[PDB]
Design a protein around this nucleic acid. Structure first.
Ligand code: MG
Lengths: 57, 58
DNA sequence: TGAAGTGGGGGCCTCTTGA
DNA sequence: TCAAGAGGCCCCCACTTCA
């Protein structure tokens, strides 16, 4: 049936995620929530981005 | 069918567990493994004892 | 009695998918 | 492409269960 499409993170969102990754490979529960607010993404999305980022690297 | 029995912890083991609990309500994996080794219990039993002790503390 | 089971949070890691 | 699915394994709290 119809399903929700994956939406790519913008250049700005990716830049900030990367900028933060350069300072911390792992984020605590509070930090994820905060960054998710700054990026306008969900806590989970930030959590998974870091997870895939640690894996990719 | 027959299933493994629940074995109680000795007075000495519980005494040491209650001693550590008065020092820390929670333990890290290294702390849980070192205590398990000392008491002759697995790390899961220790983990589960602190979990239960906390619930009962409520 | 009281350690252990059930089940519902989250989490990290690892590999793979497919609009 | 690349965020997300999903198996494998961990810690926590609530609330029982029954040798
Ligand atoms: Mg796409």
């Amino acid at each position: 049936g119809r399903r929700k499409p994956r939406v790519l993170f913008s250049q700005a969102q990716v830049y900030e995620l990367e900028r933060r990754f350069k300072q911390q490979r792992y984020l605590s529960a509070p930090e994820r929530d905060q960054l998710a607010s700054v990026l306008k993404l969900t806590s989970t999305q930030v959590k998974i981005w870091f997870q895939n980022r640690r894996y990719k690297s």
